[PDB]
Design a protein around this ligand. Structure first.
Ligand SMILES: CNC(=O)c1cccc(CNc2cc(N3CCC[C@@](O)(CNC(=O)c4ccc(CN5CCC(C)(C)CC5)cc4O)C3)ncn2)c1
Ligand SMILES: [Mg+2]
Lengths: 202, 246
């Protein structure tokens, strides 16, 4: 299918093998950098089943503080090479810029490759996003355009997204989503088989 | 609105459209007064025993000439860099600023820092505008997914224990390897001590407050005993941001 899809769930416990393969994966994880409700420990992060979600394609992984190092670890553990690193310069509505040594002007998102992705438009965008802080904890919607231009029309999956992140061509997972909303027939079939009563427990 | 779409449309990097009380500036004055004379030493750093550089340093600025800096125009590999015995000349509490480029260096430079005993505390980005050449497109590294328009300078602390983590300047001319001088202002504004080393500096980077070591320096004036005299008592622990001792 094409229109937004999503699953309220505990991403630790969902059997993501029902979802199929994706050209792009994106994750904005609740790292234990400072333990709020929703945070994952470093071993839980490490044991997520990312390796089944792609055969060839790209992963986008937001990192901050010491997750700059830990996300590099999960990225490599999950089978990816880090081939780029996007920074979003945070500006106000007038395009002026808004870690105990230096104030932070930017957010980091690792870009990882798995396999040999073929047919992608590498090089259309550049590695700097200049955009306007919406609500705190929001990522800039510009990342979806860069991803769409890079891989147009393909299946994508977001992990730890919120309801405002649901997009055409994407399946959004998160525990603050509003139930299950699945349109792709292959997914709806496997979901029914694996979850015949619709609960998601162990 | 969407400056990424705008870059796709026109070739103007999104960072071209970033704009721009207190006063400080007395800190700069204090720094300027506290600065040791500029010292410098031409040395082939591959062939050089690093341990002749004494005393141990409070700050180390490491700017090895990477092949990627020579896109269109001796380069060091991360293999070569990793083998430097940087820990043998760092003070037990000290800081490192390492220019890592924007490719595999962002990973290998972390490996170096850990190998030499630091932990990364800051990631400082030099973001290159292209306001004077919207036309010039970028030759991509095979592995690149995007156009690479920035370089990273990593900060590292070892031991026990203002400015923004961004530098925005216009992209230098092809073949110009110089990093923005603003990195020196960021470093000095930290007030980390007065023993400051710059490895792979050049005639054009020499600066008060700093000891520059590099293979292309044309002149040397370094003398380990002259250099040590600047930090003998009573100046052993000045941050670099206080008044001189009468
Ligand atoms: C039950 C009990 C304990 C633990 C678990 C674990 N299992 C879970 C968690 C789980 N989330 C836990 C609660 C939030 C959320 O619902 C939605 N994400 C966020 O709000 C969110 C906010 C901010 C950020 C930080 N970035 C950084 C980069 C940025 C570009 C600035 C943008 C901001 C990341 C986010 O991810 C996801 N979703 C599914 N499964 C389940
Ligand atoms: Mg200054």
């Amino acid at each position: 299918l094409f229109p937004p899809q999503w699953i309220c769930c505990d991403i630790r416990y969902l059997d993501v093998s029902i979802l199929g393969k994706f050209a792009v994966v994106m994750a904005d994880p609740p790292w234990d950098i400072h333990l709020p409700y929703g945070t994952l420990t470093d071993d839980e992060m490490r044991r997520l089943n990312i390796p089944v979600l792609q055969d060839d394609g790209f992963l986008f992984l937001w990192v901050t503080g010491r997750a700059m190092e830990l996300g590099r670890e999960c990225l490599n553990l999950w089978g990816y090479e880090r081939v780029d690193e996007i920074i979003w310069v945070k500006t106000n509505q007038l395009q002026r810029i808004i870690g105990h040594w230096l104030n932070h002007g930017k957010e980091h998102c690792l870009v990882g490759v798995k396999g040999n992705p073929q047919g992608f438009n590498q090089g259309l965008d550049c590695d700097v996003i200049v955009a306007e802080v919406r609500s705190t904890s929001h990522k800039p919607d510009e990342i979806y355009g860069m991803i769409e231009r890079l891989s147009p029309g393909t299946r994508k999956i977001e992990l730890f997204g919120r309801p405002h992140n649901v997009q055409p061509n994407w399946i959004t997972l998160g525990n603050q989503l509003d139930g299950i909303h699945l349109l792709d027939p292959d997914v709806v079939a496997r979901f029914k088989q694996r979850y015949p009563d619709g609960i998601i427990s162990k | 609105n969407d400056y990424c779409q705008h870059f796709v449309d026109t070739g103007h990097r999104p960072q071209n459209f970033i704009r721009d009380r207190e006063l400080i500036r007395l800190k700069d004055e204090l720094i300027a007064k506290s600065n040791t004379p500029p010292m410098y030493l031409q040395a082939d750093i591959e062939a050089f025993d690093i341990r002749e550089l004494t005393p141990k340093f409070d700050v180390i600025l490491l700017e090895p000439p990477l092949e990627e800096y020579y896109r269109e125009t001796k380069c060091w590999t991360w293999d070569d860099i990793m083998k430097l015995e940087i820990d043998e000349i760092a003070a037990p509490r000290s800081f490192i600023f390492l220019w890592c480029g924007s490719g595999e260096g962002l990973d290998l430079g972390r490996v170096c820092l850990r190998k030499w005993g630091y932990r990364r505390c800051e990631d400082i980005c030099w973001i290159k505008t292209n306001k004077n050449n919207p036309g010039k497109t970028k030759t991509l590294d095979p592995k690149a997914v995007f156009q690479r328009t920035k370089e990273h300078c990593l900060m590292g602390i070892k031991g026990t224990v203002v400015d923004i983590d961004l530098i925005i300047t216009e992209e230098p001319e092809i073949g110009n390897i110089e990093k923005p001088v603003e990195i020196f202002h960021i470093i000095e504004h930290f007030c980390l001590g007065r023993r400051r080393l710059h490895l792979f500096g050049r005639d054009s980077t020499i600066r008060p407050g700093w000891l520059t070591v590099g293979p292309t320096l044309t002149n040397s004036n370094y003398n380990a005993e002259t250099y040590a005299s600047y930090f003998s008592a009573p100046n052993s622990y000045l941050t670099g941001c206080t008044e001189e001792i009468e």
